[PDB]
Amino acid sequence: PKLILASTSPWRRALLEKLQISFECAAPEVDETPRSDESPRQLVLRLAQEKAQSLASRYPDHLIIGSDQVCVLDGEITGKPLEENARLQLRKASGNIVTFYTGLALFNSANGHLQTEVEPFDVHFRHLSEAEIDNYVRFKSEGFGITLFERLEGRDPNTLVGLPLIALCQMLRREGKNPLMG
Amino acid sequence: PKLILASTSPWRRALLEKLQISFECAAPEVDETPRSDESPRQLVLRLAQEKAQSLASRYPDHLIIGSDQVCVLDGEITGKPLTEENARLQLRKASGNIVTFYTGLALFNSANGHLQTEVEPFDVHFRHLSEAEIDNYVRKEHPLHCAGSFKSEGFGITLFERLEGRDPNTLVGLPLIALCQMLRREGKNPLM
């Protein structure tokens, strides 16, 4: 089965290219609005698998990857900021440990096999100033955002960038598609 | 530039660009040969310091960065394999094991002579690899000029169970979180 990435993120596309398996990107049709009861972990698991499953008709004999990421700023779920948004997020982060939750799903639309995983990554922020927050504004963990951090703690730095590649390699291995054998 | 990178590494240049502070590069003048009984941490501390200070006379009013990394497998410094045989040998030693990289960093301020040094570890936890996986990785990646015989930033992700360290940049070869701290201590915060 051919590989499909259910995302138009150029970040997720670039990450997946590291595995050297040919794939096609497709835009999933999913409402990402958190439900009131919903934990960060529940949300990204649900959205990861909905994104993958939503493409099953358009790509019916495929391995389909879905992923979703949020962070929590003082218990509160937060997605992409979309400029005054970006500033706010920094102010809450200062001096704190910020946990990102990244959900991942691999769906075999041929036989219906589904694998899911949620992987956290903790960003330990320096105590910042409004000056340096103002100066930074206007994060990018792979870039200039490194100036904001005390420590990054998690299984896989790729997860923080937005796709858990170690976890995905394992899911692919279960489906008989070890990137190392492709 | 007030900031100088004492390195001919193109990846250290690329990493330093992330801080968006003006700098230029110059080749350090040191002997990287390990001395008898020198430990990995001692070696990268020494070489980081030496690279930074070797430019003092050329850049006497500057903040000068030096860095050095070694790859350690079962207590021993591990070099570039050079051959496909040796690449497979290194990956066999890596399989189901932890490869530790030690990365030394120094910032020498030549104007006031302040020297700051640090060594930072980064642990790469490998999966248990088959001989086929090892053969296939070496054939695809040809990591013949990488110490440890894998590239962590790329296809090497297919070999790992987890990555453990303070800063992903350290593994690539420049401890940027640590360097930011050193730069702030000298009043050159990249955020300003």
Numbering used by the authors:
A (entry chain B): 2 to 83, 85 to 140, 151 to 194
B (entry chain A): 2 to 193
Passage from the reporting paper:
Maf (for multicopy associated filamentation) proteins represent a large family of conserved proteins implicated in cell division arrest but whose biochemical activity remains unknown. Here, we show that the prokaryotic and eukaryotic Maf proteins exhibit nucleotide pyrophosphatase activity against 5-methyl-UTP, pseudo-UTP, 5-methyl-CTP, and 7-methyl-GTP, which represent the most abundant modified bases in all organisms, as well as against canonical nucleotides dTTP, UTP, and CTP. The protomer structures of the four Maf proteins revealed a large β sheet containing seven β strands (β1 to β7) with two α-helical subdomains on one side and one long α helix on another side. Thus, pyrophosphatase activity of Maf proteins toward canonical and modified nucleotides might provide the molecular mechanism for a dual role of these proteins in cell division arrest and house cleaning.
Screening of Maf proteins for pyrophosphatase activity against a set of 57 noncanonical or modified nucleoside triphosphates revealed that the YhdE-like Maf proteins (E. coli YhdE, BSU28050, YOR111W, and ASMTL-Maf) also exhibited high pyrophosphatase activity against 5-methyl-UTP (m5UTP or riboTTP), pseudouridine triphosphate (pseudo-UTP or Ψ), and 5-methyl-CTP (m5CTP), whereas the two YceF proteins (from E. coli and S. typhimurium) were active toward 7-methyl-GTP (m7GTP). The Michaelis-Menten constant, KM, of the YhdE-like proteins toward canonical pyrimidine nucleotides varied in a micromolar range: 32.7–53.0 μM for dTTP; 29.7–72.4 μM for UTP; and it was lower (to a lesser extent for ASMTL-Maf) with modified nucleotides (4.7–47.2 μM). Both YceF proteins also showed high affinity to m7GTP (32.8 μM for YceF and 30.9 μM for STM1189). The two structures of YceF-like Maf proteins (Tb-Maf1 and YceF) appear to display an open conformation of the active site, which can accommodate a nucleoside group of the substrate without any conformational change in the binding pocket. The Tb-Maf1 contains a phenylalanine residue at this site (Phe16) whose side chain points away from the pocket, whereas the Glu170 side chain is oriented toward the pocket and can participate in base recognition. This Glu residue is conserved in YceF (Glu154) and other YceF-like Maf proteins, making it the signature residue-3 of the YceF subfamily motif. In the YceF structure, the Glu154 side chain is partly disordered, suggesting local structural flexibility. It should be noted that the YceF E154A mutant protein retained the wild-type level of substrate affinity and catalytic activity. The Tb-Maf1 Gln86 (Gln70 in YceF) resides at the bottom of the pocket, providing the side chain-main chain H-bonds to the C end of the α6 helix and thus determining the size of the guanine recognition site.
